[model samples]
Target: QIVTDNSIGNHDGYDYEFWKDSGGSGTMILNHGGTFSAQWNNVNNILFRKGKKFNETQTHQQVGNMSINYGANFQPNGNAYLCVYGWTVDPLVAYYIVDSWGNWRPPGATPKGTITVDGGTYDIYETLRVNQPSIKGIATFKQYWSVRRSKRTSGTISVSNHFRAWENLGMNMGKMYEVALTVEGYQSSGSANVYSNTLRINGNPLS
Candidate 1:
């Protein structure tokens, strides 16, 4: 089914969320096994993701060795990201490990550094958003990014590696809120088929 709302729910042991700003319109289909598909047109912002949620009490290390294996057919007409996206509490941080994109590469300039992980290198960046929308309502917060230097449609992501690297760079994250395979469109028109997705913590599948 196609959904167009700020919604959250669970399916087959996996969590899913569909969010869009008032100015955007979109549809998302939640599938079993942590897989989902989304389409958006002329959206100011829209996102759909499937994975696991945490209680905002444990750090990533405390959560365990997190990772994801995914395959997708992502097509976008404007700007978008196919990524591992999540949020944290305490510090109210937003993070993204972007593996693929359309039209525009993110963090667009001046990377803070680079880290090699999961058989690839990624540029590290941190940006501040002032009075922006977040899980904790409208607030100012930091966004940590690990943008892949090379793009791919399917692969295994060592999610914890990026977390460790970011911490090493002094990006102090708070307690975990969620970690999910996400497709986000901003001022864009696009669709994505996330055909396969599996999230694991300490090698154990979530579903």
Candidate 2:
């Protein structure tokens, strides 16, 4: 089925969501397991993701080691990101562990620091969003980012490593609302074919 609106649901035991800001248009088709395909154009922002939603019930460590193995053909004409994206409660934070991108890298600015993990090096950044959109509505929040120096389309991401690294930097995170493999585009046009996407926590498949 093709999804073209803001929505969330479960498919084949995995949680899936399609969200687009006003004036954006997109199409998403969720397949069995964690696989999905999406395309969007002239969007203010759009994201399609699949994984688990905890509803601010658990921390990343409490959830255990998160590993995602994915393969994709990502093509974007402007700004885009292929990453593990999520939100936290209490402190209200948005986070991203970007492994790949198109056109431009995200949150362009001086990085807070960098961390090496999963056979790659990533630059860490923290930005404050005042009264911005979030899972808890318009509110002030922090955005933590770990963007890889080099981009790749297929690989295994040790999601916990990034979370731990952020915590080590004193970027404390609250209970998680979600942890998902996400494809996001900002004011851009793009398409992605996620042929294989598997998320595991503590070495066990989510489904």
Candidate 3:
């Protein structure tokens, strides 16, 4: 259950079935009321991406550390994110990083160093997706981590030590298709409570 779209609500993005049990891994409850305004793109909820996109691929010491115990209320052009994706169709791409706000980058990305994952401490960035064509239309190359303090609504985040320190700095980042945790909202409103969400491989629990 790693892909579902409508983009956000019944226009053309999609609706009606992607994967039920809305939340995955454990205690789940994500709420979003109403009020929306968008011209480009917006929210249409329902997410749970556990792992592996196709076949199999995982490196960075064989991945691990993706934990969540959330609590949120977003409503300023709403956004709730904890997405980690490294995809490829033909080197086709969608690379990731987000703990909420720092504003997704690329087109001359700056800062590139700092890691600590979920429990806090992050300041990493390296970009290349120049203009959104929506998931691998071309214009791909990425990495952005933002969380320096005062953000960890709850706890737990190592996410494979931030993908093994960005693949030890060479940034090949060409393995592991999906590792998602979401609550994306735009046109904005509030509600979120994922008391627990976990994925730990090589330590246990990948159920």
Candidate 4:
């Protein structure tokens, strides 16, 4: 038998809850649900009490041949209290090329890179453009095609109750080519928000 704290809800984002009903006595902390930036963007009715702050972080990994344009999120708090970041895998696996759109294209026509953003999988691509100000349109599978092709390390951070991550992918698709766009968002009760990512691919593994 295992003994542990059994608090169900969070006490001001400090101590959470621990359960041992069936899986054995264990402790579980609360997820910030996307950090203290602004609203609680969750579909499952994730409780994000205001006044108390929550933080969310995400990471992702993907590699291949394609023009993928990632999106950004805007902090809708009283002030712009948000920070975004980007970087390379840092192994010289290949060179990061600049596409016609001025963004970094995937290292090469190969699938040897991976970037992860903590808790980003739950983000809405449509809301992302609110902060970019420069992007052309809302979050969608087709919009990624008009943006630049890139290959690098990108990520995001939030208050509490949430943590997410993500990655872009490309490949040597042989004779023909394939372009894909994905949007991840919230679908709760009556309202919902969607986040999206776009990428173009070509050739195969090492073509």
Who is ahead in lDDT, 1 or 3? 1
TM-score of each: 0.97, 0.97, 0.25, 0.17
Tell me the spans in candidate 3 whose CA falls farther than 4 Å from its real position.
1-92, 95-130, 133-173, 202-207
RMSD of each: 0.9, 1.0, 16.8, 19.1
| Candidate numbers, best lDDT first, in rank order | 1, 2, 3, 4
Q: State each model's CA lDDT, in order.
A: 0.91, 0.89, 0.42, 0.21
- List model 1 lDDT by residue over 120-142, tens digit each: 89999999999978888889999
Measured with C-alpha atoms, the lDDT of residue 178 in candidate 3 is: 52
On the 0 to 100 scale, the lDDT of residue 120 in model 3 is 67
lDDT of 4: 0.21
* Predicted candidate 4 versus true structure: per-residue lDDT over 13-92, tens digit per residue: 22222222222122222333211211322222121111111121211212323333333233221111112211122110
Deviation from native of the Cα of residue 12 in model 3, angstroms = 39
What lDDT tens digits, residue by residue, belong to model 3 across residues 18-53? 222223222122222211111112334333223333
The local lDDT score (0 to 100) that residue 78 gets in candidate 3 is: 43
Candidate 3 worst ten-residue window by lDDT: 31-40
Q: Which ranges in model 2 have alpha carbons more than 4 Å from their true place? A: none
